[model samples]
Target: WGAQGHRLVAEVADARLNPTARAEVDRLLATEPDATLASIAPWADQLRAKDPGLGRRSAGWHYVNIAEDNCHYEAPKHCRNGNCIVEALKAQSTILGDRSLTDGERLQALKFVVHLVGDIHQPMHAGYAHDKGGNDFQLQFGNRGTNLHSLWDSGMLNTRKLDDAGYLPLLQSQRAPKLARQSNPQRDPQTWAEASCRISMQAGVYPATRKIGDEYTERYRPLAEAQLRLAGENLAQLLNRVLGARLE
Candidate 1:
């Protein structure tokens, strides 16, 4: 997920949080001088660039490489390094929900939860291992040389000609209604990742030929928007369920 993508998920979750979850989020985020969930959502990506060792260690947490021919995700084989998004999300949720953890620990957990939820929802993030999640698959994104992963990450959103502020409200208006009715709060993050992996295949994300332009944007933009909507809804549900009972 890009910065805007992460921010959108956080914004939607923040909107849906119950009073207790909201208050707890406020308390945990207090460690940062001026951080809210939305603001802190992109911390991991920054850390990836700023801190190399930490980045390498947590690299696998951003995605899980499932083969295109087979959808099955074997934890041992694929996530042998313990660096997959599903595992990270599970661990982070536990840390955030654990009352025994220090405030600093919980804060880091909160950041991971905020990010990995968004990451798992992105189709390419749960993409094929052979293509390195489409990193090696070169493509023309509006005549610019780029890879499929970058295109999915932020290029499609850019093609829509809107910044994060404009994009969030536009998505809320266009996609929210259907998503509101279908989103299940009780669903697990692993299931969400699996669903994303399947969606990537169905969406025809991998172009047979490299050249793409307006047509690609038109065809995939809706899918991108839909994924963003689902990510937001699911994140809200996850946070509400995890934090709600604890506070109560």
Candidate 2:
């Protein structure tokens, strides 16, 4: 997901935070000047230029490439030493939830959690390790060349011509299709990763022709929006769990 996609996730989450969670968020974000959930949602992507060392160290936290065979995330096989997206979310949420931690530490954790939630929801981010999560799969679209990962990142969403503002209501209202089968409430990041991985493995996710057609967007746009909404909803629930309690 790109900046627009990420912000939408954060915005959706912001609107859903419980009072306790919202208060905690307000308290922590006060430590950072002009920072809000939606504003900090894309901050992780800026690490490469803003803060080189932390960025490099946390690079692997954004994604987890699983085997195309089954899309299951076995700890040893997919992530080692708590490096991948699944583990990263659990770890960071722990850090964010710790009341003893300084506001600075918790605020940073909040940033990573917001972005990681968005990334883990993007199907391509949970795609096959064999192709570097589709970064290697080349394609032609709109008289230009791009990879599958890039296509999912911005191209497909760009076709809609809606920025984050326009996208919010569309996502909130009936404009976005819901996956009723996922009705059972589950907040597990690992499960979310596996589910997203399965979508990447689904039919038409990869186009039959090298050139992407409108049919591709028509088939997957709803899925993308659905994922974004789920990411936001899941993020709110996670934050509510982690930071919902009032301090002693």
Candidate 3:
């Protein structure tokens, strides 16, 4: 994936996530109205400190559930590390209640939410039946050991160093707290899965027999591009859902 790919994923998530968690972000963002969205923006930077493999401005959490068996790993559509996102939201809700969250956890959830939502969008994150969600599918990224799984996770992230603000301006600029009107989130688990699977299929477009190369890169670019769009759009919706009520 390239610049456009990450931008698209960020856009997809930007749309989907805001709506679901609008009220939550609203309360937090509102109480801190004087606060720049950029402050919360640091969440992404801080996350990079903990997980350097993750791009400073790319997705963070929400990997496909591949821990137990290779079940969900096989078909990303079947995978759902639902708890990660729930835990993040729970943390956000807690801090919002106390209004005294430390710098460590304060923006952690927000930044993490930004990243994780994109994780689920990557088809490979879900898992692969043959290679432990591509963990076993080792190949060279440049000069180091790389696997299909890790490639999907940090592929675009490692390539870019853009600041949070520069990550995806067009998508961010169009932000609105509109999707919060929808009252349900869990009802659409399958929807999220199907959507992600679509990209996962694309991620595997140019499966390499021995290693990744320019050909492989070109093939997977579309997958990366699709995930990017999905991430940004979804983020918008998810944010609106979580923060809209509080803004009202």
Candidate 4:
């Protein structure tokens, strides 16, 4: 996802957060000075560029590489040495929910939670291992040379010409309430990963030809929007559950 795409996920989560979750998020973020959950949601990605050691180690946390043939997400088979989003999300959730941890540690975990939630929703993030989540699968977005992973991450979203706030309403309007409610990644990350993996396989996201432009965007924008909305909804639900927020 692009910066705006990730921001959209965090913004929607912020709106849906219950009072308890909101309070805890605020308290944990206080050390960062004027930071909110939305503000810190992209911190992991940004920090990766600045911190070499952390960046190298955390590169795998951004995605899981299920084989295209099997498309089944077995952590042991797919994610070697804890290098995948599923385990990253699960471990971070545990850290965030642990009140005994220091605020600093919880804050770091919360950042990972926010980031990994958005990461897993991007179809290619759970795409085939052979392509390194589409990084190696070259494609063209018009005359621009890019790969399938990069194209999905920002190319599709960029066509909208909308900022995160602008895209929020458009994306939110396409929500699948029933589908969103069915996902429970706060308890099981595999449940969410399975859905994304299926989407990559079935969504017609990969065009037959490498050359793609307006027509491709028009054809698949709905799926992209729908995924963004789902990510936001699930992020909110995950936070509400982990924070012990009685939203209902």
Error of 3 at 14 (Å): 6.8
Encode model 2's per-residue lDDT on 1-248: one tens digit a residue: 88988999999999989898999899999999899999999989898457778888888888899847578788887888888898888888888878898999999999989999899999999998888988999998868899999888888888889878899988888443333343122348888888889989998897889988578888888888888888888778778778776566
Tens digits of per-residue lDDT for model 4 on 2-98? Answer: 7777888888888888889889988888978987877887888887778899987898898887757556777787777878898889888988889
Clashing pairs in 2: none
In angstroms, the error of model 1 at 84 is 0.8
Pick out the ten consecutive residues of candidate 4 with the lowest summed lDDT.
Answer: 178-187
- What lDDT score is found at residue 217 in candidate 2? 80
Estimate the TM-score of every prediction.
0.92, 0.92, 0.55, 0.92
lDDT of candidate model 3 versus the reference = 0.48
> How far is 28's C-alpha from truth in model 2 (Å)?
1.0
**Candidate-wise lDDT, in order:** 0.80, 0.85, 0.48, 0.81
Return whichever of 1 and 2 wins on lDDT: 2
> Model 1, stretches more than 4 Å misplaced?
175-187
The lDDT leader among the candidates is 2
Tens digits of per-residue lDDT for model 3, 42-151? 34434556765654323323444443342223333332332333333334434433435644454445555455555555666554445655668788776677877767
Per-residue error at 248 for model 2, in Å? 10
Candidate 4 regions exceeding 4 Å error are 179-187, 245-248
